[PDB]
């Protein structure tokens, strides 16, 4: 009120709402996984000039094993990060397998010197694709030596990017530092070329009920209280909408059950007080709020009187009847009376009376009183003019 003194009455104040307890996430637990095991357990890689390209789809491109695996030592992502890879989706990933010199790790960097780079396989200067390099010397090394991967492709004429020497003595487990073969996995992804269909797995949490919580089903976010429902969705239907076009029922991806959504309770708060003259005691009203739940958590309380208007605290309920003093609602009024305290009761409409009506009786007055009464009516309000400019 921006004042140091408040007149008798009932006044509005801040709003009241229930905060969510925690967050819950549910997703359709994965059963389709890409055959990464067989992908990286290949007995022998193909020719360098015939590097494979396997488009990956209809299968989750899980990367946790990569993080979990301790075999990998070098793992750099120059375009993304593993932390945000959880909520980042790639349209499609191509698994490209080839055999390259161990010392060419330095020259594989995009936009790096060395004509060997574009002589064997040119990389675009903006190739931010992550490169995985885990030692596989014994796995991809033979006792005699891999002479198949000849590197005599030293043609003078340069080969344009997608226009349409023999320094390898043998890949053996005894190879020295920088010469041992290393398995290379190419993370190639594109944008705005096809709908996203390959993503990392998303974890799930146990379902809860009867708690104002934050939920996220298949990208549908909100806040509410989850509960079992008898609605019978169709086999191909997922959500439920009301006439106002607001979500009111969802189907859990994992367990095919229909759960209702109800907003967390909230309502306004008001303060009832007599004039600051008489006292400073007050009583608060919670508009349209359940009463026997808030006190579960005026710390003493000891005065809770449920009413159709909502929970009421600080006033004692007396079952007499008087005229309305500070209206509350639904035929309830509060007033200050003595042992001074605030009381709440049911308003009285007036004193009972019963006319002694008959069929041969009439009453006639004997004399009179002249009465004078007033009446106040507004007539006009102060003029006012304003200069717009």
């Amino acid at each position: 009120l921006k004042s140091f003194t408040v007149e008798k009455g009932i006044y509005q104040t801040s709003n009241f709402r229930v905060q969510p307890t925690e967050s819950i996430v549910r997703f359709p637990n994965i059963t389709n996984l890409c055959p990464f095991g067989e992908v990286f357990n290949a007995t022998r890689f193909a020719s360098v000039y015939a590097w494979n390209r396997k488009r990956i789809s209809n299968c989750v491109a899980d990367y946790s094993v990569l993080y979990n695996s301790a075999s990998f030592s070098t793992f750099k992502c120059y375009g993304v990060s593993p932390t945000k890879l959880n909520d980042l989706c790639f349209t499609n990933v191509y698994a490209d397998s080839f055999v390259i010199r161990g010392d060419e790790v330095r020259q594989i960097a995009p936009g790096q010197t060395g004509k060997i780079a574009d002589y064997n396989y040119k990389l675009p200067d903006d190739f931010t694709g992550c490169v995985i390099a885990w030692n596989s010397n014994n796995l991809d090394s033979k006792v005699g030596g891999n002479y198949n991967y000849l590197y005599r492709l030293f043609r003078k004429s340069n080969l344009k990017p997608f226009e349409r020497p023999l320094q390898s003595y043998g890949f053996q487990p005894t190879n020295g530092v920088g010469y041992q073969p290393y398995r290379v996995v190419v993370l190639s992804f594109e944008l705005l070329h096809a709908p996203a269909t390959v993503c990392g797995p998303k974890k799930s949490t146990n379902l809860v009920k009867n708690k104002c919580v934050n939920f996220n089903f298949n990208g549908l976010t909100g806040t509410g209280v989850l509960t079992e429902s008898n609605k019978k969705f169709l086999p191909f239907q997922q959500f439920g909408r009301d006439i106002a076009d607001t979500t009111d029922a969802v189907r859990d991806p994992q367990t095919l059950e229909i759960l209702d959504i109800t907003p967390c309770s909230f309502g306004g708060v008001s303060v009832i007080t007599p004039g600051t003259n008489t006292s400073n005691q007050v009583a608060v009203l919670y508009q349209g709020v359940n009463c026997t739940e808030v006190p579960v958590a005026y710390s003493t309380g000891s005065n809770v009187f449920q009413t159709r208007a909502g929970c009421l605290i600080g006033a004692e309920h007396v079952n007499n009847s008087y005229e309305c003093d500070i209206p509350i609602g639904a035929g309830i009024c509060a007033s200050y009376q003595t042992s001074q305290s605030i009381i709440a009761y049911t308003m009285s409409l007036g004193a009972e009376n019963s006319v002694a009506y008959s069929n041969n009786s009439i009453a006639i007055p004997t004399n009179f009183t002249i009465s004078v009464t007033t009446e106040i009516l507004p007539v006009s309000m102060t003029k006012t003019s304003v200069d717009c400019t």
Binding site: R17, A244, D245, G267, G288, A330, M347, N353, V355, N360
Partner: protein, 313 residues
Amino acid sequence: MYICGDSTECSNLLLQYGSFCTQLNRALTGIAVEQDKNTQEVFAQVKQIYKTPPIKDFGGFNFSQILPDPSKPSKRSFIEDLLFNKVKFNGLTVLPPLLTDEMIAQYTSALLAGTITSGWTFGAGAALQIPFAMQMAYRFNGIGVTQNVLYENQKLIANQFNSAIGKIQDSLSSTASALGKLQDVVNQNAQALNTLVKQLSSNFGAISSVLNDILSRLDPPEAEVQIDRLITGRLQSLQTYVTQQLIRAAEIRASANLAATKMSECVLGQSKRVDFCGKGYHLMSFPQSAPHGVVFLHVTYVPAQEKNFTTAP
């Protein structure tokens, strides 16, 4: 809550405009208080609540169709029951009325009993009893007809009145277009609320209508640009809704004042104003309670069969 449901950034941005929410809340509170004032003014016009005597010996008339029936758990009359039968999830609350339907019914019953037992005296001072035949004779004398007419056609008049109430009850039970005004009021309010809720799905020129989606999609400059656009749109919608409510409230207040005047001038007495309390020569009236409104039953006297004569001054 309505504009920026669960968004700290949105709340911070709205702080720029500021006092709009306070202005809107003040206006709506004013309207809410005015409603209770209207109901109180229209109905609460009796200092004491009278009650009808046990015996219904009203000179042959028959008010059983309008007086309360204690047998029903709800203390409402037949006509009131007929009328009653005939007629929170996004930050919008509805406050209950101050006076409950039981209190309204008690007020109406008090008015009716006081009328039929004491004529109009209770409207000016203390209630005074008077037989109903005497009261009818006084009313007839009021409209310019001698008393012997009533004292000799009492039985015929009683039969006509009873038949009239029978016909009115049957017409109300059968027809369904009599409560157009109240039905229209309810429909208009519901439609306004529905449109206001539906306004939340519009882009208003923003990329999307989901605040969390915008926040998680775009970065912090276009993000706040879109948020500002949405805030502007929703604020405009709220202002329009509030203005509509204000105009409708003014109209309803005018109607309530007219109803209060009708009650005071017809129920509590007899009026010489033409076509005010019903067509014809007014005799008396009876009120009834209906959801979000009131209903009257004007009783009037109408000549039927004429003749020819030769006249000199």
